[PDB]
């Protein structure tokens, strides 16, 4: 939601819908220029907040754990999934070959 406006009056539905589309197209900087808004006749702007946010879906470590489990069940080092430095890479191939295969 971008904005909430509120009244105790009853408003003509067709004109209300038109007004919503005018505000939406005018205020966005991509579409339109206008930015100040003047309310009259008692329309009130209602403050609100994002009651549930994408920020709380910090899955990132849990899925990483599952990837490690899968990678571990076969027994392939992560350096082979990434590629690292020389000192990492050349011994890890021998690790993978000798221990697993």
């Amino acid at each position: 939601i971008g904005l909430i406006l509120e009244t105790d009056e009853i408003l003509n539905k067709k004109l209300r819908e038109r007004k919503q589309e005018e505000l939406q197209l005018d205020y966005n900087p991509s579409t339109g220029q206008s930015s100040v808004l003047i309310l009259d006749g008692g329309m009130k702007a209602k403050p609100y907040s994002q009651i549930s946010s994408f920020k709380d879906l910090d899955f990132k470590e849990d899925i990483a754990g599952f990837n490690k489990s899968i990678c571990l069940a076969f027994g392939v080092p992560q350096v082979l999934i990434d590629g690292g430095n020389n000192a990492n890479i050349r011994p890890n191939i021998e690790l993978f070959y000798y221990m697993t295969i």
């Binding site: 489990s69 571990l72 069940a73 027994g75 221990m99």
Partner: protein
């Protein structure tokens, strides 16, 4: 021999198992990854050590008089007519 033996005998006259929870252990090994991997690493690593047979001590024993070449062939090559060496080692 050992005078105390008759007493020690009564402290534990028969062995008892210690792997309680055998079913849930077999579930865990069959279903939980980190157990399966670490156990397989240990078993598969231990199974591939060769055995060397050395000199013979003069003391008498149970398995008397077995020629070294036979014992070597049994340990390294073929435990019995029907089962390989690797399967035998991994089972043990």
């Amino acid at each position: 021999l050992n005078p105390g033996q008759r007493i020690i005998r009564d402290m534990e006259p028969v062995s008892h198992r210690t792997n309680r929870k055998p079913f849930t252990t077999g579930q865990a090994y069959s279903k939980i990854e980190i157990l399966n991997r670490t156990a397989n690493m240990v078993i598969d690593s231990a199974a591939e050590c060769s055995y060397t047979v050395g000199d013979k001590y003069n003391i008498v024993t149970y398995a008397n008089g077995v020629k070294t070449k036979t014992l070597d062939t049994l340990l390294n090559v073929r435990p019995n007519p029907f089962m390989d060496i690797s399967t035998f080692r991994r089972l043990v």
